[PDB]
Amino acid sequence: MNAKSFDGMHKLWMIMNPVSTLWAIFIFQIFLGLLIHMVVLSSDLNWHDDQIPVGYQLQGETLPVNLEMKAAQ
Amino acid sequence: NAKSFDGMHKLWMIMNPVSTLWAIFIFQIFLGLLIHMVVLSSDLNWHDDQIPVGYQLQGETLPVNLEMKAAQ
Amino acid sequence: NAKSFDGMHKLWMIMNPVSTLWAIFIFQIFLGLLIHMVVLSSDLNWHDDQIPVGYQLQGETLPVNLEMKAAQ
Amino acid sequence: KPSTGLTESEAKEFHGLFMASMTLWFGLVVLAHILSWMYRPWL
Amino acid sequence: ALLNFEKKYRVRGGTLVGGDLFDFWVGPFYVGFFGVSAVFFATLGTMLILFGAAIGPTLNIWQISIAPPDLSVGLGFAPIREGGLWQVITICAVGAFVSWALRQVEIARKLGMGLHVPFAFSFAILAYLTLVFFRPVLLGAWGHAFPYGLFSHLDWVSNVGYQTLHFHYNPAHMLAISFFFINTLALAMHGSLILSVVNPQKGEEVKTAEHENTVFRDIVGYSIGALAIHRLGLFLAINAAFWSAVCMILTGPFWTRGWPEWWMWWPNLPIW
Amino acid sequence: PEYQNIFNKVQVREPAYPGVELPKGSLPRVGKPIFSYWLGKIGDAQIGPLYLGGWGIASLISGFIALEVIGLNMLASVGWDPRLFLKEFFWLGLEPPPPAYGLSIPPLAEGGWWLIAGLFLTMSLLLWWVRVYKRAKDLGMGTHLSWAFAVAILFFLTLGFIRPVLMGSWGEAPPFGIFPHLDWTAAISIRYGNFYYNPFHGLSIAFMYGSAVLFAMHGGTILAVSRYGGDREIDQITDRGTAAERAMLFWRWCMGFNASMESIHRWAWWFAVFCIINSILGIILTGTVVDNWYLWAVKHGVAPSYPSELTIDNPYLT
Amino acid sequence: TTGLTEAESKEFHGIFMASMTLWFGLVVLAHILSWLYRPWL
Amino acid sequence: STTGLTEAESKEFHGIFMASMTLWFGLVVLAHILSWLYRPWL
Amino acid sequence: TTGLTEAESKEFHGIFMASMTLWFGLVVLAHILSWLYRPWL
Amino acid sequence: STTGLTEAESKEFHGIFMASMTLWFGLVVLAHILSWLYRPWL
Amino acid sequence: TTGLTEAESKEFHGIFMASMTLWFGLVVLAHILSWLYRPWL
Amino acid sequence: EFGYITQYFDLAQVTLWAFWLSLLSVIFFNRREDKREGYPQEAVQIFGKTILTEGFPFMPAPKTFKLPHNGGDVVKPGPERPQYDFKLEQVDRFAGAAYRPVGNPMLAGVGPGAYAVRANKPDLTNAGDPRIVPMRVAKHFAVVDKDPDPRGMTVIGADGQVGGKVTEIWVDRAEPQVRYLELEAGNKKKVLVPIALCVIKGQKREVKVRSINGIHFNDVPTLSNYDQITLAEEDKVSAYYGAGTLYATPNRAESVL
Ligand code: BCL
Ligand code: BCL
Ligand code: BCL
Ligand code: BCL
Ligand code: BCL
Ligand code: BCL
Ligand SMILES: CC(C)=CCC/C(C)=C\CC/C(C)=C/CC/C(C)=C\CC/C(C)=C/CC/C(C)=C/CC/C(C)=C/CC/C(C)=C/CC1=C(C)C(=O)c2ccccc2C1=O
Numbered sequence A: 001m002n003a004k005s006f007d008g009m010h011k012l013w014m015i016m017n018p019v020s021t022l023w024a025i026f027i028f029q030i031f032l033g034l035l036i037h038m039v040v041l042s043s044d045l046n047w048h049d050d051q052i053p054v055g056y057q058l059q060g061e062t063l064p065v066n067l068e069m070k071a072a073q
Numbered sequence B, C: 001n002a003k004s005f006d007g008m009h010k011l012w013m014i015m016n017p018v019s020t021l022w023a024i025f026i027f028q029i030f031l032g033l034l035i036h037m038v039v040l041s042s043d044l045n046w047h048d049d050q051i052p053v054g055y056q057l058q059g060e061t062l063p064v065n066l067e068m069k070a071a072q
Numbered sequence D: 001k002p003s004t005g006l007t008e009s010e011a012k013e014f015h016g017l018f019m020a021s022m023t024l025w026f027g028l029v030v031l032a033h034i035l036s037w038m039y040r041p042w043l
Numbered sequence E: 001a002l003l004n005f006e007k008k009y010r011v012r013g014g015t016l017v018g019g020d021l022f023d024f025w026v027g028p029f030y031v032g033f034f035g036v037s038a039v040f041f042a043t044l045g046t047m048l049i050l051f052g053a054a055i056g057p058t059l060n061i062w063q064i065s066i067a068p069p070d071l072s073v074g075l076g077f078a079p080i081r082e083g084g085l086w087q088v089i090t091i092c093a094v095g096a097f098v099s100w101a102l103r104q105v106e107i108a109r110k111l112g113m114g115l116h117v118p119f120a121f122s123f124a125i126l127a128y129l130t131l132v133f134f135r136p137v138l139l140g141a142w143g144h145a146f147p148y149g150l151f152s153h154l155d156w157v158s159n160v161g162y163q164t165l166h167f168h169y170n171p172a173h174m175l176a177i178s179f180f181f182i183n184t185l186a187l188a189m190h191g192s193l194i195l196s197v198v199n200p201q202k203g204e205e206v207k208t209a210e211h212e213n214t215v216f217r218d219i220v221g222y223s224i225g226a227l228a229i230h231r232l233g234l235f236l237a238i239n240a241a242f243w244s245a246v247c248m249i250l251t252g253p254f255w256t257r258g259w260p261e262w263w264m265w266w267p268n269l270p271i272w
Numbered sequence F: 001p002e003y004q005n006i007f008n009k010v011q012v013r014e015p016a017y018p019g020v021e022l023p024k025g026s027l028p029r030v031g032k033p034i035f036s037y038w039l040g041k042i043g044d045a046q047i048g049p050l051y052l053g054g055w056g057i058a059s060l061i062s063g064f065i066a067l068e069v070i071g072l073n074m075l076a077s078v079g080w081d082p083r084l085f086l087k088e089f090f091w092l093g094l095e096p097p098p099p100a101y102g103l104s105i106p107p108l109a110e111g112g113w114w115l116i117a118g119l120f121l122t123m124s125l126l127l128w129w130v131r132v133y134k135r136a137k138d139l140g141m142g143t144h145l146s147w148a149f150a151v152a153i154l155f156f157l158t159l160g161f162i163r164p165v166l167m168g169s170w171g172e173a174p175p176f177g178i179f180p181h182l183d184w185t186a187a188i189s190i191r192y193g194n195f196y197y198n199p200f201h202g203l204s205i206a207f208m209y210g211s212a213v214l215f216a217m218h219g220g221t222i223l224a225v226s227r228y229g230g231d232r233e234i235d236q237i238t239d240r241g242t243a244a245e246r247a248m249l250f251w252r253w254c255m256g257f258n259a260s261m262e263s264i265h266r267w268a269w270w271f272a273v274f275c276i277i278n279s280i281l282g283i284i285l286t287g288t289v290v291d292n293w294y295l296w297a298v299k300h301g302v303a304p305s306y307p308s309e310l311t312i313d314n315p316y317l318t
Numbered sequence G, I, K: 001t002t003g004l005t006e007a008e009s010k011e012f013h014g015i016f017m018a019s020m021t022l023w024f025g026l027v028v029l030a031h032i033l034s035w036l037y038r039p040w041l
Numbered sequence H, J: 001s002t003t004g005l006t007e008a009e010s011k012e013f014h015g016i017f018m019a020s021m022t023l024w025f026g027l028v029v030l031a032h033i034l035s036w037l038y039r040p041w042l
Numbered sequence L: 001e002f003g004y005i006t007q008y009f010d011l012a013q014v015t016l017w018a019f020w021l022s023l024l025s026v027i028f029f030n031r032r033e034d035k036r037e038g039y040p041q042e043a044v045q046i047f048g049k050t051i052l053t054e055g056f057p058f059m060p061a062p063k064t065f066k067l068p069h070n071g072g073d074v075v076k077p078g079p080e081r082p083q084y085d086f087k088l089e090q091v092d093r094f095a096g097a098a099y100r101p102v103g104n105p106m107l108a109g110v111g112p113g114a115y116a117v118r119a120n121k122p123d124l125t126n127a128g129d130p131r132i133v134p135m136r137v138a139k140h141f142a143v144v145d146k147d148p149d150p151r152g153m154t155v156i157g158a159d160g161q162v163g164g165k166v167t168e169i170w171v172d173r174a175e176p177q178v179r180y181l182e183l184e185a186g187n188k189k190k191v192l193v194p195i196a197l198c199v200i201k202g203q204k205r206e207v208k209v210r211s212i213n214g215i216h217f218n219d220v221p222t223l224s225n226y227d228q229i230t231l232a233e234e235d236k237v238s239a240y241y242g243a244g245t246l247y248a249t250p251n252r253a254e255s256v257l
């Protein structure tokens, strides 16, 4: 068979505790979420510091008011 | 199915409501602090970007302060 | 969406009011101190910006102090 | 249930004096700051 | 607040100084004469550290620093802005630490128990006094002690270490490190064993003393015993502190070369 | 004064205790127990018996092969002379491969013996892990001693196998000596800019100091109430007597909060384990992520800034 | 297992879902404002 | 109840709690309007 | 072993599978958006 | 009977265990075929 | 409890207020002298 | 360029935050385990009313110890057995004042002389036998020569007077060691003294007990059966000797300097 072979699957919860399993799954998912976000942020795919669509620190350094104040010094 | 989630309210017969509430609140506060600190450490920082103006630089170039620093 | 928050007052049948009050007060004071110190450590600092005038520099250039520094 | 053993009359009395004292304290604080602003304005 | 069982133990007496005037509690704390002293000195010391940060360049927590006098002051009295503040704070610190120990003695006398904890605290106090009093006196200047600052007392530690080219070869330093490491190992094993005996495998009874002996005799062949492990603990921690004090009193006063050159006494024995 | 309870004044003997009965199917215990008068002055006097099964024999074969290798190379480094071995013993060592060999297997007298000894020592410690786990579990106890042991093994493997592989060289690992391994410690601090500005190093030092503090405090407190039967902690846990009550009042009155007779052992567990967790975290990031800890600390606003007064001219810029 | 009957669980669930929906609404509003001020993608 | 409050006591407490929280948030908003007028940060 | 009968296990299994399917649906949607914005392969 | 399962319970568990393991290995094979099409490593 | 009755509290309050007033008087006098000798503002 | 910076955010920073959060969270769990004994605590209110408070964080849910040999279940945090009947007078009229014993301080059970209310069963070995027993019931023990056998010596009592004579040694079968000395007192009763409150001089053939006085050995609590001791009796005996550290002489509770 290939369709009836997963029939008694629902009995899984007669040997595994449902509440413990739920908590374990949730905690593991949160840990993995944090980990994958940190792994992708540490690569060329980083999206906070890529200066797209614009660089904001650089934008602040070249405002006309800041430039005119830095010239007077 | 649209009616797959009907017994969902029974969740609180196996999970403790009060402990879950406290856990949710504490986790949300921790995550709030964390995301604010992660964004403050990047190019999107909004306290030190000198927009709309740089204030320390503004104080160093006031005419009164300049005239006092000249007399020295 | 008009009656969905009706039983909300029954919050106080599972959370102790006095404990919650004390927790809220302490958390608010801690957060107040933290945000003031985070803003004081940035370009928005308002004690050292020398606005509206620099006072140490103002004291160094008083005529009496200048005349005493000259005779030396 | 947490109680303090004060009745409602005793609580009213305490509240009266507490509010009076807090108001006086804040008045003195405001006065100190007006003097400081007159002498050395900081903003 | 009082514990369920606390009221019958809160009796008067047992004090050293003072008497009935300072014999009360404030909340859970017990005050006494030395409680008043300790809080007085702690408050004063803290406020002076803060002021010494205010006259410096920054109020960043990691970069505050209050430094001792120069070596030219000798064992004299330094100006307030160039060392005297450090001296006042280091007087407050001694006052607070000794007050702490004597308050402990009062408490233990009231509860009817032995004076082992203040006695073990005395050795921490002794190490501190070695670093601020004994070594400076033997070398002839207060300016040989460390400054008060996180990150700034670490620069002191580093440079003092490199004044002997390689401080790892200091013998009393080796002995103290041995005791520190063995103490962490012992504490891990003790914690684990008690937890394991009162938290057994699911659906079992709490185990006994025989189980505690058996497990370590099976793994290692020897078990020291439930009362002797507490002794072994007091011993390892006290010895760590003691040999630290010795290693610092040796460096400078009694040895001025590199530390590797001391060890040269061993391969020069005329017996190999 | 009063008796301090540091030495046993009167000793007593009964026949040796063979041990709690093991599950059926186990091997017997080897050895006939002997008694030590000097060990009995401070603790328990019985020595042995010992349990040697499958995992604790494979361990002890691995470990002794490793020891034979290390000892023989130290001895070959002085020309086989045992007199010189005793004379210069703290300066001898078995050295790792030259860093130019990378992660390959080098010839035997240029780093291959180091590699052999490392492999055999590793296997020894993992077999010992399994022994410790099974010994505690066959008597029906919780397996808390295996968790802490696992942490320690992980630190041994980090400095030594994991960090050298992530760097690309076996020559980044410590040698087997006394003064040689101290030299390794100093050099790795010098190369990666001052471990005092590594934050995980600071946190593990916090927890090592704390281990000494906590164990002085606990050892003192239990010796100070042993007149009321406090050294018997299991009974004080499952039926609180006056010893536990006095022990917890002392700390409550002194510093404002306390633990219980069972909880203090969880504080001990954690203070010993966080030390090594921070050890792993501090070594695993050095070299692979951070190249100069002092410059890192300067970038994140941590290092103090002494006044200058002078100007020194970098001669590479001239 | 938690001592709540089925009616108490239904009540708790009602208010829990309402509160979570309101919270997520406020989050969405904060992000729309932030995108208008400083777009990050 | 596991706090000992009845439903009437809970209703009373809730009334005053919500009033107080609203007043506090009002004062916070006022402080921020003044700060924006003096030193705008965005 | 867990005290659940066979009916309770069937009930739990129904809701568990529904929830897991919904979660995986949301994951797929997030990845389609990310591929449209910043393709990584 | 060392685990308390009878022979019928063991047969049941074995059926579902083998089905699950086969499905898992199928998914693994599929992942590797996709990876070979994208970035061949041998 | 502090154990004090209302009469004892009245007595204590009388003397406490008198003492505090005298102390503050002496403080004011010290500051007037210091201002005459070395003005700080 | 010696200190050039490429990027402010790195991995060491994030990992440090994660550690700050992983500590800060074992503190939470340990502080909750700390409150399975002695709680809820009693807070005294403005005018004397006492309420039960619980602290921060709150108390955990009860767990069960299953004691061996059908020794029952212990739930913690759970109920408490009732205190006995101590009498105390407060010294100063405020919640934080100290207390004085009302009658004879030695026979009052307050202060260092307080004790707990344990089970009235003996502590057991792994086989089910009583653990602390006299050396005539445990017929396999022997004192190691090289050590002074205390049987026969006298029990000088801290003011120089004689208390009685040692007649038995009480041993511990689970861990072989001495726990108590039994002695016959001045009025011919049999009383115990813990071995951790005795200084044994072999040559003088004396045992010095600095805690109590010589005449005080007549009022030490006694046992029911002299072939075993229970947890309650251990507590009573030890507590009586501990009361003397502060009440034996009227000058002991009176400020050294
Ligand atoms: C450039 C930035 C601005 C600045 C921007 C802001 C902003 C924005 C805010 C503050 C707020 C506060 N600022 Mg400010 N502030 C600046 C400079 C200062 C300086 C100083 C030495 O320079 C000080 C001492 C203060 C102090 C304060 C506190 C009054 C207040 C934080 C309250 C709190 O923590 O409650 C926590 C404690 C509790 C909640 C416990 C319960 C409180 C109880 C009910 C009573 C306390 C009353 C409280 C003190 C308010 C008094 C109001 C009365 C009607 C008089 N600011 C500079 C000039 N400040 C906050 C505020 O105003 O809150 C309304 C606020 O949102
Ligand atoms: C450049 C800034 C100004 C300055 C600006 C301010 C501002 C602004 C304030 C102060 C306030 C205070 N300043 Mg000032 N202050 C300056 C320099 C000083 C110097 C000094 C050595 O240079 C000192 C010692 C002081 C001391 C003081 C305290 C008197 C007062 C804070 C007391 C307190 O914390 O109450 C905590 C104690 C309680 C709440 C106790 C409650 C009741 C008790 C029993 C009675 C306390 C008496 C109280 C201290 C004085 C009240 C007045 C009496 C009628 C005499 N300032 C400089 C010149 N100062 C604060 C103030 O005025 O309070 C109204 C304040 O708002
Ligand atoms: C390049 C530098 C050298 C080096 C140079 C030095 C120098 C220099 C010193 C040491 C000292 C020590 N070194 Mg070394 N050391 C090096 C490498 C190492 C390594 C290693 C793994 O490489 C280790 C493991 C050690 C370990 C040690 C210890 C043996 C010793 C520190 C413990 C101590 O002093 O306790 C003693 C305890 C105290 C001094 C604590 C005082 C406690 C006081 C009384 C209580 C304070 C309470 C507080 C104020 C209250 C706050 C209250 C809040 C409410 C919480 N060093 C490198 C090679 N080392 C120190 C030492 O031996 O001094 C005696 C020392 O001076
Ligand atoms: C460029 C980046 C933007 C920015 C982008 C965002 C984004 C995006 C978000 C925030 C969010 C928040 N920001 Mg912001 N934020 C910026 C700068 C700041 C500054 C500052 C000093 O610069 C501060 C102090 C804040 C503070 C805050 C908090 C109000 C809030 C996170 C709440 C939380 O942790 O709930 C966790 C705590 C709990 C769940 C406990 C239970 C809460 C109870 C019910 C009461 C709390 C009141 C709640 C915080 C505010 C709603 C009250 C309304 C007045 C009705 N932001 C800059 C300008 N900020 C989040 C938010 O708005 O939440 C809806 C959010 O999604
Ligand atoms: C280039 C990279 C993309 C990016 C690519 C992805 C991809 C791909 C995914 C995410 C996913 C997530 N991203 Mg993202 N993400 C980016 C930037 C961010 C930023 C940011 C500060 O820049 C933040 C704060 C987030 C945050 C998130 C979370 C919402 C989510 C992880 C959920 C989780 O861990 O649940 C784990 C916890 C549990 C399972 C516990 C139970 C959860 C319960 C059921 C309720 C939780 C609410 C849930 C998170 C959201 C539902 C809201 C809807 C109204 C239903 N991303 C950038 C733009 N992100 C994942 C996601 O969306 O999942 C669907 C995901 O697949
Ligand atoms: C060039 C290399 C390829 C790549 C080549 C491969 C190959 C080859 C394989 C994977 C496999 C996996 N890859 Mg990949 N993978 C790449 C990049 C990624 C990235 C990423 C951020 O870049 C992530 C997050 C993943 C993540 C994953 C996991 C989904 C999966 C590992 C499952 C596991 O650990 O079982 C551990 C846990 C269990 C076994 C528990 C048992 C099952 C339980 C009941 C629930 C599990 C659900 C399962 C995780 C999801 C499948 C569900 C389907 C929607 C039906 N890959 C790159 C692009 N990857 C493996 C896989 O797909 O397995 C079939 C696999 O063989
Ligand atoms: C400062 C100020 C503003 C004062 C104003 C307040 C006023 C006016 C007065 C208050 C009165 C007085 C006199 C207060 C003095 C107290 C003050 C202010 C400060 C001191 C607080 C202080 C020093 C705390 C440090 C705490 C720390 C960091 C401890 C380190 C070790 C540590 C983490 C221990 C945790 C584990 C514990 C709890 C161990 C204790 C413990 C041990 C060791 C056992 O062996 C044992 C055995 C059996 C049962 C219980 C125990 C037990 O609980």
Ligand SMILES: COC(C)(C)CCC/C(C)=C/C=C/C(C)=C/C=C/C(C)=C/C=C/C=C(C)/C=C/C=C(C)/C=C/C=C(\C)CCCC(C)(C)OC
Pocket: A030, A033, A034, A035, A037, A038, B017, B024, B034, B035, B038, C007, C008, C009, C010, C011, C013, C014, G008, G009, G011, G012, G015, G016, G019, G020, G023
């Ligand atoms: C019996 O009757 C009673 C008494 C019980 C009646 C009582 C009923 C009452 C009063 C009920 C009240 C209920 C309340 C107030 C309920 C409030 C419920 C709320 C607000 C629920 C909110 C849930 C929000 C959740 C679960 C959000 C989860 C977010 C997650 C998991 C996101 C994670 C993001 C990640 C992992 C990415 C990180 C991004 C980055 C870049 C930092 O990664 C490193």
Ligand SMILES: COC(C)(C)CCC/C(C)=C/C=C/C(C)=C/C=C/C(C)=C/C=C\C=C(C)\C=C\C=C(C)\C=C\C=C(/C)CCCC(C)(C)OC
Pocket: F067, F068, F070, F071, F072, F075, F103, F104, F105, F115, F117, F118, F119, F122, F156, F157, F159, F160, F161, F173, F174, F175, F176, F177, F178, F181
């Ligand atoms: C003369 O003596 C005789 C022969 C008679 C015996 C006497 C033995 C004596 C006296 C020995 C003295 C020994 C001493 C003093 C030893 C000192 C040891 C110290 C202090 C060592 C300190 C640190 C060493 C460490 C941390 C080594 C770590 C190594 C590791 C983790 C190795 C990892 C290698 C692996 C896992 C192998 C990989 C290999 C492979 C094949 C996979 O590569 C591809």
Ligand SMILES: [Ca+2]
Pocket: B046, B047, B048, B049, B050, B051, B052, H041, H042
């Ligand atoms: Ca800005």
